[PDB]
Amino acid sequence: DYFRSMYDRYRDVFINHINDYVLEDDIKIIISKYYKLLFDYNCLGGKNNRGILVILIYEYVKDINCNEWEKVACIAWCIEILQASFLVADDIMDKGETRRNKHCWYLLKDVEIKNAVNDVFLLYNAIYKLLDVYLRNDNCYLDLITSFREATLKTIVGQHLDTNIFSDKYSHIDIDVKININMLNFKVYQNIIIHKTAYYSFFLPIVCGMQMGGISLDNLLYKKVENIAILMGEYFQVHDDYIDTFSDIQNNKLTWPLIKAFELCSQPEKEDIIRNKDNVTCIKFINDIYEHYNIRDHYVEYEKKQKMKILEAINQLHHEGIEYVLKYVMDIL
Amino acid sequence: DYFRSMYDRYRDVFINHINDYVLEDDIKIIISKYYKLLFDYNCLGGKNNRGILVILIYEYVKDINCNEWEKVACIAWCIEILQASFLVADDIMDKGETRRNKHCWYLLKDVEIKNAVNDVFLLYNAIYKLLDVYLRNDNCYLDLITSFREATLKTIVGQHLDTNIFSDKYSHIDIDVKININMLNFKVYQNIIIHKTAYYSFFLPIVCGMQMGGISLDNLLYKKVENIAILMGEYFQVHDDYIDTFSDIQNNKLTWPLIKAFELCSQPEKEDIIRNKDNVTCIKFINDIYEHYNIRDHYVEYEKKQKMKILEAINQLHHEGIEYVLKYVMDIL
Ligand SMILES: Cn1c(=O)c2cc(C(=O)NCCCN3CCCCCC3)sc2c2ccccc21
Ligand SMILES: Cn1c(=O)c2cc(C(=O)NCCCN3CCCCCC3)sc2c2ccccc21
């Protein structure tokens, strides 16, 4: 897995493109420092699951030469940069404090929101910059860039839903230039997760690996895989929420524990949940409500069932390497 | 000029793509309302100079059929959406209040910064979505998307410079995770303007028009034009600053009046300028300093000289239609 070592080779390259700009040497030095810091800060320290998935899938769908490895590692790090851009955007939107156990990029003294927005856009453009640099001549250049386009669009729509579903505008169907009860249900939650997480996290890396491996687009796999991605997305996102509840409640996010507590709890407890926001007492009240009906074991049951369904789908893929890769990913948990 | 009427045909199309997503009808209705509002709010009300430039240049480099008009209007509105995304990003970054004589998109009750970031990214992706929808089969699809890539990258770098040049980090050349005197000069100002404004505002539309007209990329025009764009950018950006000073001072932006006042004023007045921020008294002090040395007439002299140089470059283009279009643009002022 010679993936991390390639990082510099790509990052520097992008900065080199900015170095070639018509600027004075001093400005060049300062911007190179700043953008190197940005990349090393927001694209490092994570598990890099997406890029590793890309690499594994490409290897298993294929004895691979150096140019292929370079292209694949570029794609993996491009997806990692997409993750970083989404992560910084979410830190800005959700008013988060710590990401990867360090201060959010927009919270730094030298980087306010003003810099954070511009930097997220820089990262998003750098993705396609590197893709153009390394894969324009490859037969799947348009397929890859359009896969990134669609994954980003669906993630953006999912983030919008995750942010604004309980807002006043989403209630009662015009806009004027609080929990919405009808909005909390498993169908809306599935929509939010699938668009928000499933595609960019799972579908996009798998599709990139398959396309680089030589699988034709019209192959039926690209739909089966999609379904699997959806399921996996669902699975992991629920897991994520399970980790959060053990600041979704603070930001009034529609979460799996909320929906299941609402389903299980009585009407007075539904009213109590509705009444409970940036206040510790309300958060602990909702945590106690969750712990009363023991939603933490319902998550275990859901994990079992969803993993069963995912494995059933994987066995229906009928492709040895991709099946092994996805089974390994699920075994990671 | 059948440009505005096409707007809906493109906007709806993009929303239709989002409608095709796997969502419930209610969520579909709400998101369609919200994104239609976003597009109609941030992409309408302006002069639409960039798109009109695209259309005029394409027409003059060419008796044009319907598919060509559709593609060209799509490109023009894509550049307008790029303008809107940059405009909303700048409103977020500079903490502005009114844009196009109405509340900034991020200031609305139903749209905070959280929604504004996601919406700017949505608009940026919608640009390439429409480009793919309308021009993927055209021979210049990659050229156009890469032109957009580079224009956006240079605009992002220019915005970063315009925002952070006077910051502490830019002084003395590492980052720790006030006016910088050495930074204010005509060379740094030229860099900031050229990257920030010249390319996306002028070079990008001209290049799109020429490429759609059938001009080969390796033609020498694509460099002469670049120079002209630079000059024009410079010109107009200075004009823009002249309009602002008649909130650049509030946000501590490096502006043409600041540099020229520093050049003309004595050392005590340089210290006074440095000492003067979100305070009315300081702003009026700097305005009085500007009005003392009458920088408002130095702007007139600069306008004359820069227009002369731009016209000299245009006469050196040696292309009738593009020369006429650029002369008309300069006559707009
Ligand atoms: C391949 N692989 C993965 O792809 C994946 C994804 C995961 C996740 O929890 N994602 C939620 C993040 C929500 N963001 C949405 C974007 C918009 C804003 C940011 C917020 S865990 C995970 C994983 C775990 C172990 C092994 C492999 C894995
Ligand atoms: C074709 N045409 C133009 O292209 C143009 C551009 C103009 C301008 O003042 N731009 C500054 C805007 C700075 N933004 C930078 C992006 C990053 C953040 C936003 C801030 S005026 C103008 C113009 C005027 C009359 C006729 C034609 C024209």
What's the CATH number where A26 sits? 1.10.600.10
Counting the structural domains of chain A, the total is 2
User: How many CA within 13 A on the CB side of residue B168?
Assistant: 9
d(CA A122, CA B287): 35
**Angle (nearest 5°) at CA B122 between B118 and B125:** 140
**What distance, in Å, lies between the first and last C-alpha atoms of chain A?**
20
Surface-to-core class of residue A320, CB atoms within 10 Å of its CB (0-12 exposed, 13-18 middle, 19+ buried): exposed
Tell me which H or E stretch contains A180. none
Percent of chain A as helix, strand, coil, to the nearest 5: 75, 0, 25
In the chain, the amino acid numbered B101 is N
Query: Separation of A3 CA from ligand 1 center, angstroms?
Result: 19
d(CA A60, CA A322): 7
Which among A138, A167, A188 is the end of a domain? A138
Could you say which of B109, B117, B153 has the minimum Cβ distance to residue A93? B117
Q: Is residue A202 in contact with ligand 1, taking CB distance under 6 Å?
A: yes
Query: Separation of A204 CA from ligand 1 center, angstroms?
Result: 12
**B114 shares its domain with B127:** yes
**Are A132 and B114 an interchain contact pair (Cβ–Cβ within 8 Å)?**
no
d(CA A213, CA A219): 13
Q: Which residues of B touch A110 (CB under 8 A)?
A: 167-169, 175-177
d(CA B286, CA B60): 46
Contact B166, B254 (CB under 8 A): yes
Collapsed DSSP state (helix, strand, coil) of residue B278 = coil
Residue B277's contacts (CB-CB under 8 Å, 6 or more residues apart) are B249, B250, B252, B283
**B56 shares its domain with B185:** no
Smallest Cα distance from B305 to chain A, Å: 23
**B132 shares its domain with B153:** no
Residue B272's contacts (CB-CB under 8 Å, 6 or more residues apart) are B285, B289
**B88 shares its domain with B180:** no
| H and E: helices and strands count for chain A | 14, 2
Helix intervals (H) in B246-333: 256-264, 267-275, 280-292, 295-315, 320-332
**B125 shares its domain with B241:** no
d(CA A163, CA A248): 11
Collapsed DSSP state (helix, strand, coil) of residue A255 = coil
In the chain, the amino acid numbered B197 is T
Give the distance, in angstroms, between the CA of residue B47 and the centroid of all CA atoms in the same chain.
12
Whole-number CA gyration radius for chain A: 21
Q: Which two tokens stand for residue B45?
A: 């009300």
**B216 shares its domain with B182:** yes
Residue A108's contacts (CB-CB under 8 Å, 6 or more residues apart) are B175, B177
Contact B43, B113 (CB under 8 A): no
Surface-to-core class of residue A171, CB atoms within 10 Å of its CB (0-12 exposed, 13-18 middle, 19+ buried): middle
Q: Which two tokens stand for residue B117?
A: 């970031």
**B85 shares its domain with B120:** yes
Query: Separation of B83 CA from ligand 2 center, angstroms?
Result: 9
Q: For residue A98, which phi and psi values (nearest 5 degrees)?
A: -120, 135
In the chain, the amino acid numbered A225 is V
**A97 shares its domain with A143:** no
Q: Which of A189, A202, A256, A191 is nearest to A233 (CA)?
A: A202
d(CA B114, CA A89): 8
Collapsed DSSP state (helix, strand, coil) of residue B218 = coil
Q: Which two tokens stand for residue B277?
A: 């921020």
Domain range for A128 is 1-138
What single DSSP character describes residue A294?
Answer: T
- The residues that bridge with B278 in the sheet, in sequence order, are none
Contact B53, B325 (CB under 8 A): yes
Q: Which residues of B touch A41 (CB under 8 A)?
A: 177
Q: Which residues of B touch A92 (CB under 8 A)?
A: 113-114, 117
Residue A59's contacts (CB-CB under 8 Å, 6 or more residues apart) are A72, A321
Q: For residue A226, which phi and psi values (nearest 5 degrees)?
A: -50, -50
d(CA A213, CA A59): 8
Surface-to-core class of residue A28, CB atoms within 10 Å of its CB (0-12 exposed, 13-18 middle, 19+ buried): middle
**Are B191 and A27 an interchain contact pair (Cβ–Cβ within 8 Å)?**
yes
Contact B126, B16 (CB under 8 A): no
Contact B277, B283 (CB under 8 A): yes
Which among A138, A163, A178 is the end of a domain? A138
**A117 shares its domain with A176:** no
d(CA A160, CA B122): 10
Contact A232, A329 (CB under 8 A): yes
Q: Is residue A127 in contact with ligand 1, taking CB distance under 6 Å?
A: no
d(CA A127, CA A129): 5
d(CA B221, CA B218): 8
**A276 shares its domain with A133:** no
Could you say which of A113, A157, A177 has the minimum Cβ distance to residue B18? A157
Resolution of the structure, angstroms: 3.2
In this structure, chain B runs to a length of 333
**A144 shares its domain with A186:** yes
Q: For residue B207, which phi and psi values (nearest 5 degrees)?
A: -60, -45
Please state whether B23 falls in left (phi above 0), alpha (psi between -120 and 50) or beta: beta
Decide if A37 touches B, using CB distance below 8 A. yes
Which among A83, A104, A138 is the end of a domain? A138
**B156 shares its domain with B297:** yes
User: How many CA within 13 A on the CB side of residue B297?
Assistant: 5
Could you say which of B125, B142, B159 has the minimum Cβ distance to residue A149? B125
CA dist list (Å): A138 to A71, A78, A267, B101: 9, 16, 59, 48
B:240-259 residues touching chain A, CB 8 A cutoff: none
- Pairing between strand A102-103 and A98-99? antiparallel
Query: Separation of A240 CA from ligand 1 center, angstroms?
Result: 8
- Pairing between strand A102-103 and B102-103? unpaired
B/e letters for B300-309, b = 16+ CB within 10 Å, e = fewer, are eebeeebbee
| Number of CB atoms found within 10 A of residue A168's CB | 13
